[PDB]
Amino acid sequence: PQITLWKRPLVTIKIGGQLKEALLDTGADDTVIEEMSLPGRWKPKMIGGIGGFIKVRQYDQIIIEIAGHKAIGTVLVGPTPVNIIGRNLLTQIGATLNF
Amino acid sequence: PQITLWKRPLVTIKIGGQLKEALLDTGADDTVIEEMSLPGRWKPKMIGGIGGFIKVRQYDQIIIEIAGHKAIGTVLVGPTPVNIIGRNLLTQIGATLNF
């Protein structure tokens, strides 16, 4: 689709067998989701931005469906205020910024 | 242009006659720039990011160029980690997300 930016660009995602709402975020390098279970091994990571850093769990090779488009990549899980789809998965669904 | 997301979507902006680097950030409602001098009166705002909240100074009706595109709108100034062009100005330059 073409998504305008008058309001937050929220979409439905399917991850880990669950439906969530998430923000398409070109400012985020990484994808970070509120607390949930995911399969496989993980390792701790710190991610930062406005207000500083939070500690998350990094899971690799996670699938995911974003607004009906599948992909695979790293998903960070932790105390994010907002579920965020970052560039690592936006590329895979073919998302670009156009003006 | 069409900006892909394999790298950070960094552009040059012009504000106060000076060129700066900034990030096109669909996850940001507002535009936040590092400490600088802007004319006029300001109002207080708090904004929440990944790590918590910061206090910023809100300046309205500021002339700003984004990747050569002229905008006039609200600019927040404060301890952001990078200069962020948020949706308030992305809409002025006609930006959309597309996939």
Ligand SMILES: C=C(C)CNC(=O)[C@H]1N(C(=O)[C@@H](O)[C@H](Cc2ccccc2)NC(=O)COc2c(C)cc(N)cc2C)CSC1(C)C
């Ligand atoms: C993996 C990450 C999300 C870490 N990256 C980052 O945090 C990067 N940023 C991003 O990815 C930004 O899009 C974030 C996303 C976000 C939204 C709501 C809660 C938390 C975080 N937005 C913000 O930090 C603040 O955005 C605003 C919001 C959400 C509301 C208002 N009113 C004003 C602003 C500026 C801004 S700083 C950055 C490093 C460029």
